[PDB]
């Protein structure tokens, strides 16, 4: 079924949306930790009107939940000389979701899943393994989970039209 | 002159209620240092990134807020590294003369006057007893600076939901 | 009451550049405590090897002697925060920062240079002496309570 | 085709730590070119006087000869940024910048060490003739290839 925004209208490809955590402000970039300036990791900002930096999603217009896609980015400027497309860090412990992914690859896919009760909420699983958060050095960083696919430690999201 | 300040919804303006100070002419205006010889205190910049609010301020007075009456300006934030306030006042020092963060909200040097600004409603421009808040070139783009008498940065107050 | 000695084995002097290297990565420089607290700055061990650290100088309310009050200074062509190089201790904090921003002239600022253990030119900030703690940047220089002192020597700078 | 000495009138040897300091602050150190670019580094005079620079090792695709290929790389025990410690020129650039993450065995990375006007010990890097110069940035003088930047290598200690 189509994935909704606050709004309750259906998400659409090419479109700016802030993911906002469904559970402080939006999503954003910064660096994992004090080892690693790029590629960067994804903080919940602790600024509590920040609405997050927009991503638009993509698929391999409208987005559908237990679907494939992709989470890139939409900045006009970029530091890093890599990608604005979530992916995950295979070789770190925590298995950080870090920017530099390839949008056209496997790597990169993500599936919008149904969490909990309350409507228009989600979490990103990664085929089933979801998409939570842990601690890190600019605050919570998201992370991929061990997970059976529940939604104990998956990190709930919303997903807001940028206007 | 001394009628109401109203916010983007022509709403008047309320003292001790959270308005991000959108530039009325990127995004809103934001704590950042003016140069690489001044971390503390902050300037006021414009953020180059669309969709960012600003950091919302406070108004207080010396509830409504009125045009060409004493305010003072303080950014609302739960973390602030530097060890001065978050109220807005003019670094005299500096030959900028920006508008910078750690003034005292009781003090006459945090004082500003909002008056009218030209074209549009709900349009605004800071002014401090005239000598208006105009804007700068700096290290993280454009910050709010003193003028010295056109260059005056028009503002618009939007409330935070 | 006897001098301090630098690594040379000579007599520490007032007004004078010295790096204060750990005794036990690099020398000792101004950071940040966290990202709690931007000014005044923290004092960092550095992990990069061959830095030599921030050169301080030594003032005493022109021997550096042992066990007397002296006051350590950051010693710097560029200072971004609005307070003194002066070393000093954060009182609000839990965990009792060597701080920067204090008054060079006032007690609050006031060290004592005492001996550490066994190797000469070795010495302790101090009766709580100067350990380390974990930190954003590394090892932070803190106040202990009341085995845990951070050991420096100090080298002149040439 | 003579060996490069360092400040001491030694002969350089490759695989060997030594701070690149200006021969006309402290040494040279990594630090970005501005604020649009965090990695790769550029390669800043930092401006605290007895700063001896980050150290650097010399490689050749034991002798550093003058007017030869040869790769400057980085020594430090962390690199944040997701590529090489090795001095390369970032060709997209308009000041061309001279900046890290060069691949030390390829054709992009090779500098030649030439004998620089008067005093002894005192050398400025050329690419293959286009010479190593300064441009102002962010963090003060950045290196960068003219269309010259005086050093002498110090023996780390
Ligand atoms: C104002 C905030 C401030 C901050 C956040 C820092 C932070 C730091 N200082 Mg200090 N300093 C700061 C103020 C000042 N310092 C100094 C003088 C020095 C000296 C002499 C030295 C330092 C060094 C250090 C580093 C110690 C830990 C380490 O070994 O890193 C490991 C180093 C890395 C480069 C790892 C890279 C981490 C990366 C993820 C991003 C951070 C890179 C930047 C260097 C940090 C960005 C803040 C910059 C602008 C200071 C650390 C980067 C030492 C150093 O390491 O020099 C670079 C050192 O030798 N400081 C002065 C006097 C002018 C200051 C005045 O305000
Ligand atoms: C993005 C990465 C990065 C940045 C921004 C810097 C920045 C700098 N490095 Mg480098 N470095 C960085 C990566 C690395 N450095 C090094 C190793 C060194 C060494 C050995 C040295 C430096 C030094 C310097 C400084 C040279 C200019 C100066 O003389 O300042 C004057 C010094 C100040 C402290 C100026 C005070 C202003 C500043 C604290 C204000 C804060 C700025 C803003 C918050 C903006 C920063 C955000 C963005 C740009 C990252 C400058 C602070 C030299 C230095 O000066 O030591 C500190 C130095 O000796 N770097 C390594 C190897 C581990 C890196 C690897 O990633
Ligand atoms: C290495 C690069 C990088 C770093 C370190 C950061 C860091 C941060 N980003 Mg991000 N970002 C970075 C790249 C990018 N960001 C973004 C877009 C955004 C957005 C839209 C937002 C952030 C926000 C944040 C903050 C989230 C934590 C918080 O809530 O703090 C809150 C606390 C403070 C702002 C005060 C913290 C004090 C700080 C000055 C201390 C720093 C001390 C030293 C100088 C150390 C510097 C670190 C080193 C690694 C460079 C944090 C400061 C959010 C934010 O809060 O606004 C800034 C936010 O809304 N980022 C883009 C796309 C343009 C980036 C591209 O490179
Ligand atoms: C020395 C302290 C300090 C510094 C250097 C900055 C710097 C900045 N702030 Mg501020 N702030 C600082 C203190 C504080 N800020 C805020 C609250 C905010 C808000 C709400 C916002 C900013 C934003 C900005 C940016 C404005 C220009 C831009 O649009 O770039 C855009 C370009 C990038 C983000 C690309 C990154 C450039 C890269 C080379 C540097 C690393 C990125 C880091 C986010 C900056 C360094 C880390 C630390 C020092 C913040 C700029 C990165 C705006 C922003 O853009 O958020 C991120 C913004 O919306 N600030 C608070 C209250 C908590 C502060 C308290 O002290």
Redesign the interface.
Known sequence: EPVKDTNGNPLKIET?Y?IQPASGGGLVPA?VD??????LGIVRT??????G??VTISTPNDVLTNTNIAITFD???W????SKTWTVDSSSEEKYIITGGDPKSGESFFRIEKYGNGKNTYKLVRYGKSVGSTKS??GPALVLNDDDDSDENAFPIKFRE?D
């Open positions: 700016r802030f660096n004090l080892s690693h300036l790029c590629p602790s600024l509590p009107y920040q609405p930096l927009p900045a006009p400027i530091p890093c000389p890599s050095l600019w940028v």
